[PDB]
Design a protein around this ligand. Structure first.
Ligand SMILES: C[As](C)(=O)[O-]
Ligand SMILES: [Mg+2]
Ligand SMILES: [Mg+2]
Ligand SMILES: [Mg+2]
Ligand SMILES: [Mg+2]
Ligand SMILES: [Mg+2]
Ligand SMILES: [Mg+2]
Ligand SMILES: [Zn+2]
Ligand SMILES: [Zn+2]
Ligand SMILES: [Zn+2]
Ligand SMILES: [Zn+2]
Lengths: 340, 342
């Protein structure tokens, strides 16, 4: 009932309908079918019925409701301790993986504290002050082509990071590093449609092997970042290709957890985007053909639907039922007994 | 090794996806009864021939435990009749009831007492009621029993089978307690909408079924349907959809209040499919920008969609309903937990 390790996978912008696309548009059975314990979260922020990713992720990373655009700060704008900082005090190794820039609102709410999510140069500099042990994502520009002219990589190397800006490597290439960071694009990683391939699964496997090196317990947040961008663009093949990749990472996590026996895997989203619907195909006589799906959208923004939570591993029963998003944080602390 | 329920209440919200359910968290006074549920599953709703299901195949999945074609009522993909949960209940000495806010002959209620090649055959469906072992029903659809193209009087046949029938109003329990079976036909076609003054019919009817079917310490099975959530969806009419699902949520609280007091009753809440691509979008301010402080509901289709659908279960055996499975497994899971003879 007490997990040693926690992997949190966040599919940005995926409601149940986006999840459902994997049951129609992906070869084979989705890894979602492996879960038995399922819950539901209410995703409103402290001030807005519709959340953004910043307050959405800060509800998970810090266990409070805060205003849209906040990174790691409470509604009154004061810094709050995150699960990464708490994990560091409990001797837990930590890693953050994302297919957006590593400074984007979701990863950022795990290692920075900023008044507004668009302060991405401040966020990059904030990593220099975090106990983060591993990261992988885009966003090389935020560390090396800055308004202030500073070389943030040099500071990170001073803090014991090895940084790779060229490719994800084998685990044998990084096993002896103390901390490891990958910055593999200037801004966001490529889309799956532009050849990103299995970055998310590979990077999440690297984080697991790296952070568990010396029998240390770990916490990892891996984010399927571009699902939401698909929803905002009302671009169905973009959305579906990104969520199928995210379902591959879920299989990666779960294959490790099932063998390990001491790992809790939580999958959820921050909010839904686009009103994405698996509607019947539309024909011109305009009528429906229920034999076939034609994905449609109703909005270019986020929506307030409750969002599914999936949990596998010791303590996974704590995540069933219907609760506010910020209680994800408290439920993790409860089952791991990591102290605050 | 789960607990075994004596009784089962299956509540269907037709047309309600997770976004429809979520509307009760923003548009209902107080806290939704959905929040009482701990055990939660997901069903895949495709029919035997269609990725996007209709109510008939999707309800027949629940009542008979098979995938079948859109429009089938209690019949298999080859059009042969299949034994239903209500027919199994009767053979196990279980009292049965069906409630709906549509006509009682409409596809969801029909799939639990009738066997017909096509949901359009509502006069045959009303006739099938006379050969079923149903003990209790309430809904609309008086026209299918007394104003038929074949000028037969079906009501007379139902009374011939030990039904008492009321076409006036729902009564209290002591009003109907001595009757061996009870039917309420309270509208010619569909019951009124919530916006046109239906009021608390669905909870009252469900409560009444529960008292009636549990006379003399009898085990029971009830299907009650929030039928018009779907029609709000089809019309792309937010206040209609939302008032109808708020009323369904009230029905959930009625079922759950009984189950908690009883302690021997499994309550299952699900839907057959989603409809309308209903979305709790950010309100538009005016030339148009999104204001995330508040919600303005939007739709993307006039028809059903293929999203996976949430299942909620509470009571003995409810742990059977977690995880992800085909819609037709609802039937098999009900059978498995109740330990009824098949
Ligand atoms: C516009 As349509 C045929 O999806 O209701
Ligand atoms: Mg994000
Ligand atoms: Mg800062
Ligand atoms: Mg495309
Ligand atoms: Mg119906
Ligand atoms: Mg028949
Ligand atoms: Mg209206
Ligand atoms: Zn987001
Ligand atoms: Zn977004
Ligand atoms: Zn339906
Ligand atoms: Zn419909």
């Amino acid at each position: 009932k007490t997990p040693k390790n926690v992997i949190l996978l966040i599919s940005d912008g995926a409601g149940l309908s986006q999840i459902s696309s994997t049951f129609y548009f992906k070869e084979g059975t989705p890894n979602y079918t492996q879960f038995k314990n399922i819950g539901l979260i209410k995703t409103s922020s402290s001030r807005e019925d519709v959340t953004d990713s910043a307050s959405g992720a800060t509800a998970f990373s810090c266990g409070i409701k805060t205003y849209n655009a906040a990174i790691g700060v409470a509604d009154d704008s004061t810094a709050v301790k995150s699960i990464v900082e708490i994990a560091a005090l409990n001797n837990i190794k930590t890693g953050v993986v994302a297919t957006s820039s590593i400074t984007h609102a979701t990863p950022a709410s795990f290692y920075a504290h900023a008044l507004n999510r668009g302060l991405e140069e401040e966020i990059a500099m904030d990593m220099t002050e975090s106990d983060l042990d591993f990261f992988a994502g885009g966003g090389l520009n935020y560390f090396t082509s800055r308004k202030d002219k500073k070389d943030v990589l040099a500071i990170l190397k001073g803090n014991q990071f090895t940084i790779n800006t060229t490719g994800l490597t084998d685990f044998s290439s990084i096993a002896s590093n103390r901390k490891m960071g990958f910055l593999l694009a200037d801004e966001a990683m490529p889309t799956m449609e532009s050849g990103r391939g299995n970055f998310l699964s590979a990077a999440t496997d690297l984080a697991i092997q790296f952070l568990s090196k010396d029998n240390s317990a770990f916490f990892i947040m891996s984010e399927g970042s571009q699902i939401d961008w698909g929803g905002h663009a009302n671009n169905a093949s973009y959305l579906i290709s990104e969520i199928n990749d995210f379902d591959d990472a879920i299989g990666t996590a779960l294959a490790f957890a099932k063998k390990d026996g001491n790992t809790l895997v939580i999958v959820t989203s921050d909010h839904e985007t686009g009103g994405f619907t698996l509607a019947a195909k539309k024909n011109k006589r305009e009528y429906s053909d229920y034999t076939s799906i034609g994905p449609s959208f109703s909005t270019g923004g986020h929506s307030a639907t409750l969002i599914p939570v999936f949990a596998y591993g010791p303590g996974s029963e704590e995540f069933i039922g219907i609760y506010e998003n910020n209680e994800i944080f408290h439920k993790i602390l409860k089952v791991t007994k990591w102290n605050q």
